[PDB]
């Protein structure tokens, strides 16, 4: 195979721990308020400027083979925490380093690192069992504003926008962020349905305004395959002209013949019609036109194994909408009279169809169908003056936004690290089975101080001194690292989701306590 | 050809022995409890963290040509043992090195290395003949749990899971392991047959659940070749609708026309049907559909020299299944009413069909058909929080699972090395034919202490001192390297399969005693 | 650019161990907001076509022909018309 | 030596562009004068010969034979007598 190189014992432990210490010293600076940004060279354009502890960890790759082993295994912690919880990746990396460093000391000749691993996990089980006791659910919409405000690096505008967006859509609604263009942030709540496609002929414009076709109380004709001929299109319009209401024609396309018919009857006496193609592109539009149909109340024509044909239509077979707005690039249906009792049954189908599968694209267009159909989604256009700025603030908005959705499902707990510091008394009643498990429990007992300690360190004060005076104090008292003094937390508004605390700890302890059981390291030769 | 380089005598012996020592020092640390893991650089992603002594050996490839020869020949020892027994690969590698080292010492000018080889094999034959005498069959379901607990590095949960899975499937049943997703381990005992293939059209879903088609007391239609036309499919459905039972259609494929009929009758009034292709891929499905046929009781249609055709079907000609479950990627038939007296004759045919042949793939799918059919199969989804952990825990689970399946066929024997230590008195009665054969017997006599000695060493105690105090002790007494004291074994629950002990010894002595007969080494030039 | 360097230089000096650069940033933007709020007060609209001639002459590095040409072109097309420049061939 | 480094380290941090290191020196010596003046208040004279044995025992890295030997040598010569040490030969 490949020529390899092996290193034994203390030498190898040292090199990997150097890789760990570097990648964690690089990410530890971005913690809490008074944390500091990290500029990463992008290989192509202007650089990134982050504070998130995964953009920092996933970038850093080392030359030396042994140091890189340390770095890779810390990337795996920071990555497992990001996907599972969405915030708390710095908290994970510093907890990881503390378990590696404290582990690469107790490895003498008689120590059993594997039993120490078992003790570490005994300690972690008891502590996440204590977090869950002292946790409390998030109830008031002011607690939502607080969690968002905290995880956004103390930017209160972010806290208000996300709380506002979550009050008008539901705590499990669909909020989504975009690269804004203006200077300030904007909350836009799309209400109703819309797809990114405009009218075919610019003769349907009856608005005398900004290039719009605008109707009220219109019919809808939903066709899966093209409307080629005059034959298939004529009966629908006879219905529309007879009842004297406008008509929208949503099909895969309107051929030049049926198109020539539509334009003609529009330009003379003035039948009210308008046409648009389907949302697209392939298999999806087949479901999405079906969604539109039951949203308005009607049938998709030409269907594969129903083949509702256009030649035999009937006025009830057409959908009905209160108002229709169509521009040169997008159409919006607003008030579909669609028998809500049945569209709710539809929503339940699409939500189980996503819980079942995942392909990153079927699940993508899947959520498109919920949002387009469900209670209006909120979108957040972030401001800023330059590009690198927006990408920073956008990393912070998403971490703020992930945090709130992890608090509403799994409760909140004290912040600043005080969440873990308030678990050490749980560890002080463990009775270890042997000497090695006792070593592990002491490893965790020390490590629980690291988060609070690293925030005070970044604040410019003495770390362990702040930690000691917190533990001596009451249960609600701890350190506000921005104001630089001790406060009640919830009254002051410092809280974190319990999910982010427990997953950060658990992914770190899992990975770190296995590194400390190593005795040999085998690396590929660095040929050139 | 290629320019080569030759080395003679003690110089080559030393360099090869240097290669052996390195690869064996790397693996020896992973022995017994208090052994320690080894981190291997993977060329692409996060590294491995193992304790299995073949993953450690097959990785280490050395730069030097001569040391690498030593490494390769130890790799082949470690690999021969793994494929034959599945555990005990560290046990072999330390035995191989010990025979190599003791052999490259007795090689003087007057010694005959090839007669030394003959003496070693006389000693090895005598000792595996002593293992089989002091062997004892495994009878109680608790000895299964102990063998598993021991070879899994003392993880008692693993022992209970493998013992439970082997009570509910049979001691020669089919247990198979998978990458679990949860945090804990799961024992799932599959009932019936299942193949990796789902429904064709996503209109057969009648569950309103995670995208499932779920039937009870259905008919089965087994077709070898495609169901193209409306013609061939109609008579079967007339049967299903008449008897008012659902129908499953397992064919090579369901063409778009018969498919269009199936989808149509499902969506209106609501005939209960569903279609899936055959398991595959080629000649195999011809046997596996026939297996499916007799398991349920019916006939495969379109057969080559029977050509049961679809147009003349009859209700006894259709199979019957109590419960049918089909998802988007897999179908499960559970309770086939198939005249068990005949499915048993099938089992006997397939088992005779494997004893005849071996192709590593014909025998693979052969075993797939057996397991799928009768007693159901168990799967062991392992927990864990990160990937590298799951991969580690999984190497240990398979080593335990191979150990239990190698113990139920060939009995158990003491552990901790005591199995071999209790065989030395056998060697003390050999009467060697000449001086060189005496040297070989003396080589193995020394080598038998290596396993017990290397366990105590990793535990942090004096190796040879423990080995001696064991031999002075009674026959059932030996060393528990976790508790650090002497115990009865079976009462304490330390046992090993006799199969893993003898194959490790035999593959080590086999290869090592041949390396020691070398006098020249020819290597390619290391150009660049 | 000189304003960017000056904020960079003055920023890479005050970074001691107790300083919070992110709050310094917040103050920088508070000051920029207040000062661009003062420019608009002391601003005054451009009304006469001679102020057009002056604005053009200054940003053209004090080339007065450029100012007259741009003022003339903007009188005959409208102040929001379409003026566009090309590689001439003459002198 | 440890006190010196701490003053050097803490001193090579407060040196920004506007700081005056020489005035920082003056404050350091103001603080040092104030603190050695507080030692002399909470000081107390050594009177009993057990406190001699204690001081000697401590500064000898806790070697209690050394403490008693020096107390005996200082009882028999005077507290400002002359004690002198040599390379011994015995155990
Ligand atoms: N203003 C603050 N005062 C004190 N502690 C804080 C403050 N803001 C955040 N923290 C704490 O700092 C930790 C960092 O949270 P996290 O989102 O992981 O920050 P980062 O994203 O920089 O790692 C959390 O445990 C949080 O409770
Ligand atoms: N708790 C224990 N006490 C003493 N010996 C043990 C214990 N567990 C395992 N062993 C011994 O260590 C040896 C290693 O077992 P095996 O799984 O083949 O080796 P490896 O550690 O390479 O997997 C076996 O002979 C076994 O009897
Ligand atoms: F860097 Be954070 F804690 F995700
Ligand atoms: F590594 Be073991 F002896 F299989
Ligand atoms: K961050
Ligand atoms: K092993
Ligand atoms: Mg973050
Ligand atoms: Mg093994």
UniProtKB/Swiss-Prot annotation, chains A, B:
Record key words, sorted: Acetylation, ATP-binding, Chaperone, Disease variant, Hereditary spastic paraplegia, Host-virus interaction, Isomerase, Isopeptide bond, Leukodystrophy, Mitochondrion, Neurodegeneration, Nucleotide-binding, Phosphoprotein, Transit peptide, Ubl conjugation
Leader sequence residues: none
Predominant location: mitochondrion
One annotated GO molecular function: cysteine-type endopeptidase activator activity
PTM-bearing positions, type N6-succinyllysine: 7, 58, 101, 109, 167, 178, 181, 194, 212, 226, 277, 328, 372, 457
Assembly notes: Homoheptamer arranged in a ring structure. The functional units of these chaperonins consist of heptameric rings of the large subunit Hsp60, which function as a back-to-back double ring. Interacts with 2 heptameric Hsp10 rings to form the symmetrical football complex. Interacts with HRAS. Interacts with ATAD3A. Interacts with ETFBKMT and EEF1AKMT3. Interacts with MFHAS1.
Top EC class for this record: isomerase
Catalytic reaction equation(s): ATP + H2O + a folded polypeptide = ADP + phosphate + an unfolded polypeptide
Single biological process term from Gene Ontology: negative regulation of apoptotic process
CDD domains (alphabetical): GroEL
Enzyme Commission number(s): 5.6.1.7
Source lineage: Eukaryota, Metazoa, Chordata, Craniata, Vertebrata
Cross-link (Glycyl lysine isopeptide (Lys-Gly) (interchain with G-Cter in SUMO2)): 527
Gene: HSPD1
Protein name: 60 kDa heat shock protein, mitochondrial
GO cellular component, one term: coated vesicle
Role, per record: Chaperonin implicated in mitochondrial protein import and macromolecular assembly. Together with Hsp10, facilitates the correct folding of imported proteins. May also prevent misfolding and promote the refolding and proper assembly of unfolded polypeptides generated under stress conditions in the mitochondrial matrix. The functional units of these chaperonins consist of heptameric rings of the large subunit Hsp60, which function as a back-to-back double ring.
UniProt source species: Homo sapiens
The organism's place on the tree of life at top rank: Eukaryota
Noted disease: Spastic paraplegia 13, autosomal dominant: A form of spastic paraplegia, a neurodegenerative disorder characterized by a slow, gradual, progressive weakness and spasticity of the lower limbs. Rate of progression and the severity of symptoms are quite variable. Initial symptoms may include difficulty with balance, weakness and stiffness in the legs, muscle spasms, and dragging the toes when walking. In some forms of the disorder, bladder symptoms (such as incontinence) may appear, or the weakness and stiffness may spread to other parts of the body.
N6-acetyllysine carried by residues: 51, 58, 63, 67, 101, 106, 109, 132, 167, 178, 181, 194, 212, 225-226, 245, 268, 290, 328, 335, 365, 372, 445, 457
Residues given in the record as ATP binding sites: 51, 87-91, 416, 496
Phosphoserine sites (modified residues): 43, 46, 386, 464
Regions crossing the membrane: none
Database matches in InterPro entries: Chaperonin_Cpn60_CS (IPR018370), Cpn60/GroEL (IPR001844), Cpn60/GroEL/TCP-1 (IPR002423), GroEL-like_apical_dom_sf (IPR027409), GROEL-like_equatorial_sf (IPR027413), TCP-1-like_intermed_sf (IPR027410)
């Amino acid at each position: 195979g490949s020529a390899k190189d092996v290193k034994f014992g203390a030498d190898a432990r040292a090199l990997m721990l150097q890789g760990v210490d570097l990648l964690a010293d690089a990410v530890a600076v971005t913690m809490g308020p008074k944390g500091r940004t990290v500029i990463i060279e992008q290989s192509w354009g202007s650089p990134k400027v982050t504070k998130d502890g995964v953009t920092v960890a996933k970038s850093i790759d080392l030359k030396d083979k042994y140091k890189n082993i340390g770095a890779k295994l810390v990337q795996d912690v920071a990555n497992n925490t990001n996907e599972e919880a969405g915030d708390g990746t710095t908290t994970a990396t510093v907890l990881a380093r503390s378990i590696a460093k404290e582990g690469f000391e107790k490895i003498s000749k008689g120590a059993n690192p594997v039993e120490i691993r078992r003790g570490v996990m005994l300690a972690v089980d008891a502590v996440i069992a204590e977090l869950k006791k002292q946790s409390k659910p998030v109830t008031t919409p002011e607690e939502i504003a607080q969690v968002a405000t905290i995880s956004a690096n103390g930017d209160k505008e972010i806290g208000n926008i996300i709380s506002d967006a979550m009050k008008k859509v539901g705590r499990k609604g669909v909020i989504t962020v975009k690269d804004g263009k203006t200077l300030n942030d904007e909350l836009e709540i799309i209400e109703g349905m819309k797809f990114d496609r405009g009218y075919i002929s610019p003769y349907f414009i009856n608005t005398s305004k900004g290039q719009k076709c605008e109707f009220q109380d219109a019919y809808v004709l939903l066709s899966e395959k093209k409307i080629s001929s005059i034959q298939s299109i004529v009966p629908a319009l006879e219905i529309a002209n007879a009842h004297r209401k406008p008509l929208v024609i949503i099909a895969e396309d309107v051929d030049g013949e049926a198109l020539s018919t539509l334009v003609l009857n529009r330009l003379k006496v003035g039948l009210q019609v308008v046409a648009v193609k389907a949302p697209g592109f392939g298999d999806n539009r087949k479901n999405q036109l079906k969604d539109m149909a039951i949203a308005t109340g009607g049938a998709v024509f030409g269907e594969e194994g129903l083949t509702l044909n256009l030649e035999d239509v009937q006025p009830h077979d057409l959908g009905k909408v209160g108002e229709v707005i169509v521009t040169k690039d997008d159409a919006m249906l607003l008030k579909g009279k669609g028998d809500k009792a049945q569209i709710e049954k539809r929503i339940q189908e699409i939500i189980e169809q996503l819980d079942v599968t995942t392909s990153e694209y079927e699940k993508e267009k899947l959520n498109e169908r919920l949002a387009k159909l469900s209670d209006g989604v909120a979108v957040l256009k972030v401001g800023g003056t330059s590009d690198v700025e927006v990408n920073e603030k956008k990393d912070r908005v998403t971490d703020a936004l992930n945090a709130t959705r992890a608090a509403v499902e799994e409760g909140i707990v004290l912040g600043g690290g005080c969440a873990l510091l308030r678990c050490i008394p749980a560890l002080d009643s463990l009775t270890p089975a042997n000497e090695d498990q006792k070593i592990g429990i002491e490893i965790i007992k020390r490590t629980l101080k690291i988060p609070a300690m690293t925030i005070a360190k970044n604040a410019g004060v003495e770390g362990s001194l702040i930690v000691e005076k917190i533990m001596q104090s009451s249960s609600e008292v701890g350190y506000d690292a921005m104001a630089g003094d001790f406060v009640n937390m919830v009254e002051k508004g410092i809280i974190d989701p319990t999910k982010v605390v427990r997953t950060a700890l658990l992914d770190a302890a899992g990975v770190a306590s296995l590194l400390t059981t190593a005795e040999v390291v085998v690396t590929e030769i660095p040929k050139e």
